[PDB]
Nucleic acid binder design. Structure first.
Lengths: 46, 805
RNA sequence: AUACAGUGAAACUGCGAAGGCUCAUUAAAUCAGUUAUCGUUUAUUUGAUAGUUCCAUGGUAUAACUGUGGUAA
RNA sequence: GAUGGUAGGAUAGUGGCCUACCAUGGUUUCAACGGGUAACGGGGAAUAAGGGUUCGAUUCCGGAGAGGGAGCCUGAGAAACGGCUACCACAUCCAAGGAAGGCAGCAGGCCAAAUUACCCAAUCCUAAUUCAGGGAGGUAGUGACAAUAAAUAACGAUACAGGGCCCAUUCGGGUCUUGUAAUUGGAAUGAGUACAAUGUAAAUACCUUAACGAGGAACAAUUGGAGGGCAAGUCUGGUGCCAG
């Protein structure tokens, strides 16, 4: 059954509508998600 | 209900649009219940898709049981309790109770080498061997998702190492850290919470690609051109893959159908279905080919070839371990071992498997030689192909389950399957100055395995060195050379003082099979209830059973390898070994100099290897004592395993010399049962054992000569009469076979022998007849060498008679 | 209520289910009554019904239970 | 083993019930032995009903069976609806290593595929019991075969007309308070809507029953038959205006 939510996965046009170390994961999803953009090299001056 | 992210569905969309695999790494506890959603997204991105799913785990499932009658009666008694209604299933229960899941342990990953899956669920992260990684991400196909679940210790390592360079704090493992950094580098991989949020540390930006295959259309065009008989039927049955594989099958068919002899050897990677092309060409060869064919695979390892043979036969016209017997209905084929079918090679066609080079030269002589060269040595086999046989050997490397994949690129980069044989030196004559210098530096393996770009390029050079034409090692051996406690390395590459650059002249991996350090590491690892890191000590601790070797620490060579240029490369390896003996005797940067002047308290230094001739010559330039071997035929090459161990320490010379003496005493008797190898190499081994005894002993293990009454009891008086009959008459077997055992024993005991007389003593020790051993070795003057052997026997009999009697 | 003391998942226990469909056609041999069993079995019901003793309390071995595990189960 | 005798075996014991030995018996025209069914029928097998005279209450058709024969086990009672072993076929899971039960079953259907809900309150049965229960058993619901008794109106007043009805082939004859979408009046209650209480383990239903409930009493029964009549209408025929 597309256009409906078989389980929880309701399919819109392009978006998907689903539903439902602790503080470490919550902080890495709150602030430190794309904070590791300029953290790749760590002075790797190759 | 909540919209998830603009990137995680779009990644699956463009992954199935470009037919590329993709990697999800999920953290958190409630992570099993989001594989329903990712499998639904993977199917609805493109219905025309494989449905099966792997659940590789190591010891125990997460929250379920994988037995549907068991969980069915469990949910039946849950109904009978009444905490849950009848027609109710949460999506994880529905996912495991409706989908097609194949369950494997992490140990038996070799059981699923052939089949194909749409999804792979790696359950545990902390133990992930790279051979298992290479076996699962290869079988995941182009619309595929490989998901990896995590643990709180890995979350601590993630929060640590996601800042710049820090690690986790207690054998420490860096392969999983190199894994985390590679997934941070990958564009087709990202890390997701248990709540379907995003950690953008691994491939942050991802756009939805635009809505829409020329090599596939060229494949269809050339396939239809070949279509417009039974040759086209075989071509369409084979070409389930790239036009490279189709062109290879067509060219092998053209060069091996009616031309009866060519030597065609198709070389390819782990993909592309080389065995599939062989088994799909088998039916065409049975049609337009001889009545007998000869396969040379491993025994009971011909799954894809036999499956494609039966599949193509059923396509065209058909109907102690396993069954590999020959069948026909309107043909013969046998998957045999090494060439015991020399007189049974009436088959005009033989197809061999990938690399035993001398056994390959023995088997491939008088028929059409098809050969499958899997990459998974090759240069030397191509040289032996060009050194003899209209060789039309050609094949290509386009993938089968993809056209090209960043997941395959990251897997090859992390598991280090990529190689490069470029020079990149200062000079070869200036590397000969390094061969005069014998200068070596340590590896600093933590900073080496920390994935940085130039460090990874030099580490790929080091891996190409450490597995360059080696003795068939593997990715689990790379993980042992990375993440073991008893390990070190040495890169004696450059002598020059130029700018940033260099090479790898010789890698050499040590293994501290110790007493103190190994006892410390083993008492540590007994809390983790595992551990096996003492091979060279434990072989002699049962064979020779010495408390001295129980108390002395030891370094053991895991591997050591140099370039494949010339004999100067063996000179470079000898200089590296001599520099290592000098090194034993006399974040972080990815080298060491002061630690190259540092070591441990080690007594013995040994290398364990197979009994090879050049390895024996290297062991003699090494001159490390040729200690106790084992003549059990290790079925890879059939080579006997010898562990030559020097003692380079304060006071161990009497122990090592007595061990060499016991090995020498055992070898002359053990050359009768299961050591019938050579004459010159046997003399070299006896000379190496006596050289070890002479170098180690001063006058301690100095044996007395053959005593009078004991020598009278060892022979007979009439046996010595027959010896005199050989001295003044013929040396026939009525007096030269009953006494020859004691003759060869006393000759190898203790007053000199020639080269022909030494081969005669070794020939009587090997107990072969006259026309075999001397005619194989010298191949000249058979009866004259037999008379010289009789004269040496007469001189020995005259010496023993004039000594005792 | 410092050797037991009420609720009580899961285990031993006492008992429960204490009598239900289809298929091939046996003429006092299937059946019903009756005579007898000092010719015989019998839980339960009922009435009855036990006489040998030289120079202050008897033994480890298993649960449930803990702990280490295997197996897809 | 036919008939009996003697002894043993096995039995819960009697017993040619089985075996050794021995004798050649035994039933029958005073019906042996054998032949079949309205033996889905009969025999009392039993209740009978205040008029049904072989319809009209029930026990039992014969023995088996728990996939198929075989062997074993348990118990006061068994060759167990609930056990095991081996053989042969069905048959599901499986990671292909192995673990099983029986569902090769019972319900249904060939323009009525829904029974499978509530109780031991009654009668019995088991029960340690002044307690527990019994898909024994009872209660209720969907699932019409127009078979069954009632309703869809009753009673007045006023007005205004002169015609209504019957017979007969014909002419005609015979007779008499009869009509009308005319007005109008207050009484009646029943279907329905509903208080309850009773009933019952409980609930339904029957029984009893306050409140409301009629004018198109629209709170709106059918089915079939006989005959007309009409247009600036349409069609056909042809000796105007007609015939069909």
């Amino acid at each position: 059954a597309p256009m409906s939510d078989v389980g929880g996965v309701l399919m819109d046009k392009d978006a998907v509508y689903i539903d439902i170390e602790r503080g470490e994961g919550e902080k890495l999803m709150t602030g430190l998600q794309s904070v590791e953009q300029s953290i790749a090299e760590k002075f790797d001056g190759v | 209900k909540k919209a998830i992210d603009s990137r995680i569905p779009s990644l699956i969309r463009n992954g199935v649009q470009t037919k590329q695999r993709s990697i999800f790494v999920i953290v958190g506890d409630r992570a099993r219940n989001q594989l329903p959603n990712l499998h639904y997204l993977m199917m609805s991105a493109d219905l025309k898709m494989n449905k099966s799913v792997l659940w590789a785990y190591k010891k125990k499932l997460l929250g379920f049981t994988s037995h549907r009658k068991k969980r069915e009666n469990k949910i039946k008694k849950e109904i009978k309790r009444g905490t849950r209604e009848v027609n109710e299933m949460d999506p994880f229960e529905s996912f495991i109770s409706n989908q097609n899941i194949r369950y494997v342990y992490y140990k038996e990953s070799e059981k699923i080498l052939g089949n194909t899956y749409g999804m792979c669920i790696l359950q545990d992260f902390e133990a992930l061997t790279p051979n298992l990684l290479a076996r699962t991400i290869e079988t995941v196909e182009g619309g595929g998702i490989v998901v990896i679940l995590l643990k709180s210790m890995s979350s601590l390592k993630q929060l640590y190492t996601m800042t710049m360079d820090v690690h986790a704090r207690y054998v420490v493992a860096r392969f999983n850290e190199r894994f985390i950094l590679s997934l941070g580098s990958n564009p087709n991989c990202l890390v997701v919470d248990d709540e379907l949020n995003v950690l953008p540390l691994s491939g942050a930006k991802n756009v939805k690609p635009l809505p829409p295959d020329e090599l596939p259309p060229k494949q269809l065009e050339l396939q239809e051109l070949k279509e417009s008989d039974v040759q086209p039927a075989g071509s369409l049955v084979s070409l389930s893959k790239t036009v490279n594989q189709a062109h290879a099958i067509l060219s092998f068919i053209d060069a091996i159908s009616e031309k009866t002899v060519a030597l065609t050897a198709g070389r390819g990677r782990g993909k592309s279905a080389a065995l599939g092309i062989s088994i799909a060409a088998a039916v065409s060869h049975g049609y337009s080919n001889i009545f007998v064919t000869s396969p040379s695979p491993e025994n009971l390892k011909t799954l894809f070839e036999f499956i494609f043979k039966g599949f193509d036969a059923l396509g065209y016209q058909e109907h102690f371990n396993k069954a590999i017997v020959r069948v026909d209905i309107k043909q013969y084929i046998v998957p045999q071992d090494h060439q015991v079918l020399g007189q049974a090679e009436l088959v005009v066609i033989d197809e061999a498997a990938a690399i035993i080079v001398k056994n390959l030269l023995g088997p491939y002589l008088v028929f059409m030689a098809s050969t499958i060269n899997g990459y998974e040595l090759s240069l030397k086999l191509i040289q032996q192909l060009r050194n003899q046989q209209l060789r039309e050997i050609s094949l290509d490397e386009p993938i089968r389950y993809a056209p090209g994949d960043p997941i395959e690129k990251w897997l090859n980069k992390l598991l280090c399957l990529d190689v490069t044989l470029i020079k990149n030196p200062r000079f070869a004559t200036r590397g000969t100055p390094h061969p005069s210098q014998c200068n070596l530096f340590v590896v600093n393996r933590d900073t080496l395995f920390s994935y940085h770009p130039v460090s990874e390029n030099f580490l790929e050079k080091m891996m190409a060195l450490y597995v360059s034409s080696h003795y068939k090692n593997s990715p689990n051996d790379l993980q042992l050379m990375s993440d073991a406690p008893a390990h070190k390395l040495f890169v004696l590459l450059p002598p020059i003082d130029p700018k940033d650059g260099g090479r790898i002249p010789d890698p050499l991996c040590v293994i501290q099979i110790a007493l103190e350090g190994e006892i410390s590491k083993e008492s540590v690892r007994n809390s983790l209830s595992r551990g096996q890191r003492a091979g060279g000590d434990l072989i002699p601790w049962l064979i020779s059973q010495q408390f001295q070797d129980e108390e002395f620490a030891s370094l053991s060579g895991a591997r050591i390898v140099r370039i494949a240029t010339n004999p100067e490369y063996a000179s470079m390896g000898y200089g590296s070994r001599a520099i290592e003996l000098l090194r034993d005797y006399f974040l972080l940067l990815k080298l060491s100099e002061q630690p190259p002047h540092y070591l441990h308290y080690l007594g013995v230094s040994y290398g364990l290897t197979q009994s090879l001739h050049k390895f024996w010559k290297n062991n003699s330039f090494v001159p490390v004592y040729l200690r106790q071997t084992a003549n059990d035929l290790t079925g890879e090459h059939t080579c006997v395993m010898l562990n030559v161990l020097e003692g380079r320490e304060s006071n161990w010379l009497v122990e090592f010399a007595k061990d060499f003496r016991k090995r020498f005493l055992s070898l002359l008797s053990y050359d009768f049962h299961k050591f019938t190898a050579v004459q010159a190499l046997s003399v070299i081994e006896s000379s190496k054992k006596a050289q070890d005894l002479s170098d180690d002993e001063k006058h301690d293990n100095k044996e007395l000569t053959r005593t009078h009454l004991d020598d009278i009891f060892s022979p007979f008086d009439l046996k010595r009469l027959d010896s005199y009959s050989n001295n003044l008459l013929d040396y026939h077997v009525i007096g030269d076979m009953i006494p020859m055992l004691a003759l060869l024993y006393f000759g190898d005991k203790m007053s000199s022998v020639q080269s022909a007389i030494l081969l005669a003593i070794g020939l009587q020790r090997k107990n072969i007849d006259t026309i075999a051993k001397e005619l194989n070795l010298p191949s000249n003057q058979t009866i004259a060498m037999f008379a010289k052997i009789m004269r040496k026997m007469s001189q020995y009999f005259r010496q023993l008679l004039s000594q005792s009697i």
